[PDB]
């Protein structure tokens, strides 16, 4: 996603806090003072859900402008080949080499495994920053426990995100 129209008073952690529950997230780097950011998800489904859900929402009192937009490498490539104005052709983003069976897209797990591998559960997942973890049994305990931690520490001021 290209998140455009930012306040420029918003950090990267505070911008990770908005766009994280839509799905797991590879990187959230933002340029120094171009008043616009860049968020990249693992899933196409989660990124489309983020553009639907967060369109025009105000981050630090400025209506935000969400749309698509390439990476940092491709942007440097297009910028130098546009100052040389030669071709400015792009490259397709890499596929997941499907059929992939473990993964149920748009799903987050935040942190010994004998799982019965049945269909309704989730077996594999992407780790949060990055590597691949076998999904444990106790996702809800770790998640709920971390959000009680986040509430009690954020009320006193140790994370603005």
């Amino acid at each position: 996603v290209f998140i455009g129209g930012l306040s420029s008073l918003v950090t990267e952690d505070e911008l990770r806090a908005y766009f994280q529950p839509f799905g797991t997230i590879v990187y959230v780097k933002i340029p120094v003072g171009k008043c616009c950011g860049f968020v990249q998800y693992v899933d196409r489904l989660s990124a489309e859900a983020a553009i639907a859900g967060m369109q025009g929402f105000p981050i630090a009192n400025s209506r935000v402008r969400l749309s698509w937009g390439r990476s940092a490498k491709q942007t440097a490539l297009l910028q130098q080949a546009m100052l040389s104005n030669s071709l400015q052709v792009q490259q397709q983003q890499p596929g997941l080499q499907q059929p992939n069976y473990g993964y149920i897209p748009s799903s987050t797990c935040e942190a010994n495994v004998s799982s019965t591998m049945l269909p309704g559960c989730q077996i594999l997942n992407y780790s949060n920053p990055q590597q691949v973890i076998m999904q444990g049994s106790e996702a809800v305990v770790n998640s709920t426990n971390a959000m009680l931690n986040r509430l009690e520490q954020g009320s006193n001021g140790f994370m603005f995100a």
Binding site: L45, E48, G102, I104, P105, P119, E138, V140, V141, G157
Partner: protein
Amino acid sequence: MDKYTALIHDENFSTLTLNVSRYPKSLAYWEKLLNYIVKASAPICKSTEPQLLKLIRCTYSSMLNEFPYLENYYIDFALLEYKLGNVSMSHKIFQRGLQAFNQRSLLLWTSYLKFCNNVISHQKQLFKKYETAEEYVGLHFFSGEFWDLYLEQISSRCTSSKKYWNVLRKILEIPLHSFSKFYALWLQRIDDIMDLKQLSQLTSKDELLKKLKIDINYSGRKGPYLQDAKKKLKKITKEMYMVVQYQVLEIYSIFESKIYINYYTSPETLVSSDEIETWIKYLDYTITLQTDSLTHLNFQRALLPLAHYDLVWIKYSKWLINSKNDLLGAKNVLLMGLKFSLKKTEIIKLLYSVICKLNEYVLLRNLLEKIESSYSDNVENVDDFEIFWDYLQFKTFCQNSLYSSRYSDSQSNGLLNKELFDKVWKRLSCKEKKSGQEILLNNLVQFYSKDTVEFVEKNIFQKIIEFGWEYYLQNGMFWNCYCRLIYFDTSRSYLDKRQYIVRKIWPQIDKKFAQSVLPSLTEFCESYFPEEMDTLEEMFTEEP
């Protein structure tokens, strides 16, 4: 010896039946048992042994009561009973097959109508069945076979040839996978018209006279005027072809190209990472178009490949809640989603909320009894915490609403009712074996009153100190909670709560545990007591 007794004294039958009766929800055992019983009657006819036909019927009926989304076995069981002489039973077999699919399956309607053409022999009743199948499974993307079957019956029975033009004009606007055949029918049938009175078969005569400036009763030379007529109707059909071609080609290029599996398969199968994504996108597409038969049909169509996954059971229920506002519909979708999905916890958590919002609380009070009786009154010892906590919140809501408040200043007694606090304490007593102890502690310190906090401090925290259990003494969240209980109590002043904490909680924690307790207790003392931070640092300095 006959076929039945010979079959019973066979050795394989006890093994196949014991493997089915041990492992019910594995499908291959059922199909092995079934193929063996059918092969054990090598001519099947009307004279085979009735003690053995009763067993083939019990096998098929029990399998289809276990695995109700198996489309091909309803067809096969109905065709077996059709072979055995009675069509009266095969009607019932197809109709429970349609009902377990909630009337929205294409294959059972197609096979039921190619069955019913032979045996129903009454024309208006057969056409009422085709109208029923149309209103349920008509707008299916692959329903070219249904409509072509329907046009076959209309062109063979009817003598009027008006009903053919009617039905074909309804085919022309549906976005089917193979709509070009149903356009070529219309094109050659316009081109096969002969005189001006038959142009009123399509539309009304005044619609022609206004929209296309064409008079049926133009008497005169009717050659050129009929050719003008055919060219203008072919132009209108070309425009409607463009609209249906756009919608068909858009659905095919984006969504329907990517789904490879459309069948139920078995409860042990896994659906790819591609097709979970394209079914979620394709349901999200369908909801936008605001055609309701097509939306119920696409949800019932997506529940063939991943019925068990439960992503759809929740998405379909939330569609019935917040887009169409039919909330008993969304209660019934989750009630039917408990039977299929293997991960029941998210559906039971949403289900409790849907039942509470409908103001049907006795159904909640009865539904909690099936969970607290499914574990045999021992839900306090459940392995997964996610079941117990969703249970305990709504059981606390009901237990506050039955028994009126026991404490002062109008406070419902929450977790500390003597029937619920025992369920809390039998789980806090297991001490590390059960997961999720910290959330029980952290949800027991929100009382903020005098006698309520005094109950909590006298019953859990003091008693964990009195038993001296090592897991909670070791763990810094316990002492953070035992400070945060007293400090947010609105019955004490500042001096006595600060003096109570620093003088009678912090001395009690053992200095051998300080390396784990101090990182959690330091954040408390840094947030609320910055002045008394040096006392806490000098209680746990490295040199005594």
